[PDB]
Amino acid sequence: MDSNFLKYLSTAPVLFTVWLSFTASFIIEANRFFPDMLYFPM
């Protein structure tokens, strides 16, 4: 891995997009496998 390419990958827009997509993928897979969670189940 070229260090300049890694430093470019460490910039705010790239990391922002990657982190928000990663978070969205967590929410999407959680709602795919555990849908319709209006509430915390008792």
Place this chain on the structure above:
Amino acid sequence: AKSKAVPFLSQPEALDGSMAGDVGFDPFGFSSNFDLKWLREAELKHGRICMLAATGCLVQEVVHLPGEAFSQKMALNAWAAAPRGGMISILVAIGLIELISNRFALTATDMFANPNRVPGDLGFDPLSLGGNGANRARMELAEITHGRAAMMGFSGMVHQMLVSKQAPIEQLMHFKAV
């Protein structure tokens, strides 16, 4: 200049054979981006949990506590069938063991603040079996090798229980191909 485990790659920096189990195996450069003390503490913790976990996955089939709730030979059924308050107590006790055993230094910014704190040295030697100097390096090598083998084995047993819906030993005795 080359890694011994992976001969077509250069030797990873900060790896010089000092730690136990060091064969220069770090192709992704984790030790070039993160500190080796945290990585070794994490590796030992994952390995020790997997040692206890593999031993549990083998023992629970043969030996059970009395009661209906502990009679599931397959460990993934024993996760659900065991009483819930007991497992929450287990979670809280593991949290307390983490809290006091690391001496309130629990994070990536305060664990190893004391220069005397050694990776994987929590001070745990209840029967003081480490009171012998020339055994020590071989002991750490054996511990990390048992931990690595236990990690790979416990991963294989859990996902094979997921495939087969069978406890491990009787899965080896009652094998059904996919």
Place this chain on the structure above:
Amino acid sequence: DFSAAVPFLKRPTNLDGQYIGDVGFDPLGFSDVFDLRVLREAELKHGRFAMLATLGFIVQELYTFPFFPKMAPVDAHDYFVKQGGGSQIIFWISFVELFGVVALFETLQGKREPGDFAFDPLGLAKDEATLERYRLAEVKHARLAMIAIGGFIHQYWVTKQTVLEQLGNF
């Protein structure tokens, strides 16, 4: 001055003979724009894939494992898509290819040859000259097998026959 293989073409400037098997054949000028280390890694990977593929086309019709049904290799691709063995082979090839990515990154820094994976457990190349010879043999067999695998698969596609039965009649 001129290329050794094609006497009416000029020798490509980046083909100076540092890579074994160089006969100055690059009329499109691929080495003039792209890194030659990447090109040699791609050439050797494609060629080794093709050698294993041609040997598989010969042996896998000569012999078949008892725990698998019998079929042609082109239909075996479609069968092992659905049974799941092809997914296993793709997964393990990808797992090795991650360290292939690391090896290519080491190659791009000039610390690793574009074909050296340091894999010689049977010690077949003792000294330098035999290794140079085996590099020339490997490159020539790589190019030959790259042509031959396309021959095998396209001939199956047209005749609906495997190689050895096409050899017996026409």
Place this chain on the structure above:
Amino acid sequence: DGCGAYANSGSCHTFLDEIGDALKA
């Protein structure tokens, strides 16, 4: 289950028996 590692005829099909049947087919 009161059976052996290999060469079992009954309700006992071990991993070794599966290997042996995979070679012997």
Place this chain on the structure above:
Amino acid sequence: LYKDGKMQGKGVNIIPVFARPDSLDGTIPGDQGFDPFGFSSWVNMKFVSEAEIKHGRLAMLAFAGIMVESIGISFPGATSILGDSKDIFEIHNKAVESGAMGQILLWVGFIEACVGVPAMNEMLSGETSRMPGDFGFDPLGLGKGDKLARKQLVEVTNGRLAMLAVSGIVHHTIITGKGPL
């Protein structure tokens, strides 16, 4: 006699189509210049030497047992439970089901674990200067000064021949269905 330079040592090659590697020291008994794949360049020579000797002795005992059990010599009362046949594979399965071969496995493994594992580990680690295959076992007193060779070389050669003989005999029993002799 040790016959260094005739049977062993530097310069001896019994299969000269594969040239003798520089890696072989000539100290190990049975070094007759046969390493086409160059394994001696990277393996630890003491470990594989002890492994060759132990495999050879196991194959000698296997050959002797196979021949005495396929010809027809048996202990008193041994024919009854283990079957009155002569086929070695069925003898293995019957003696497993009887429980004899579990008992053999237990004691051979106890011998292997108790002194064999420490001998190999201390021999490799360099704590005893123990030679490979040296378990100090000479009850009858037959090698004292002839131990250099005419005991070691003949044992390793017979071990390798016993390995080949047992492999041949087993695969003939597989293909023919009848034991040797």
